[PDB]
């Protein structure tokens, strides 16, 4: 575990911790899951927090986030792939990638989107398959 990795996870933790108070509530986990096209129930959101929770106090703080991010898998990558692959055809098109990305809080122009695809696209078909997705994650 390197100072550089610790730093990245910290910057990652921030994006979940909206109010910047230093805790992830189910309220903020719910904001994240929803902009990823999911609709978890308040008890599903509570189940996900117990997965990280060490105290039993209902919130994730940074040391608990780090424990988890560090402890860690094929199941979770496929699960992430599915968030992007909305029509379930096994390829992430530029429309689908743009769609997910704006929901998270960007507006990319078509050239920004195509740049990102070009970066991921090994076989040059202009869409991201699963092999290529592991590579970018």
């Amino acid at each position: 575990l390197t100072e550089e990795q610790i730093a990245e996870f910290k910057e990652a933790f921030s994006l979940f911790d909206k109010d910047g108070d230093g805790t992830i509530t189910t309220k903020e986990l719910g904001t994240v899951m929803r902009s990823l096209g999911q609709n978890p129930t308040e008890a599903e959101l509570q189940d996900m927090i117990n997965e990280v929770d060490a105290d039993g106090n209902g919130t994730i703080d940074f040391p608990e986030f780090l424990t988890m991010m560090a402890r860690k898998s094929e199941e979770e990558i496929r699960e992430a792939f599915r968030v992007f692959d909305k029509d379930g055809n096994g390829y992430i098109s530029a429309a689908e990638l743009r769609h997910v990305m704006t929901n998270l809080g960007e507006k990319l122009t078509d050239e920004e989107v195509d740049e990102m695809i070009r970066e991921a696209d090994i076989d040059g078909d202009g869409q991201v398959n699963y092999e290529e997705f592991v590579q970018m994650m």
Binding site: F9, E11, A12, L15, L29, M48, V52, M68, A80, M116
Partner: peptide
């Protein structure tokens, strides 16, 4: 489950900067 969101977000941060 929760880790998938974690890596989508890591990718997302990695992409904003």
């Amino acid at each position: 489950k929760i880790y998938a969101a974690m890596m989508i977000m890591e990718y997302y941060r990695q992409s904003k900067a």
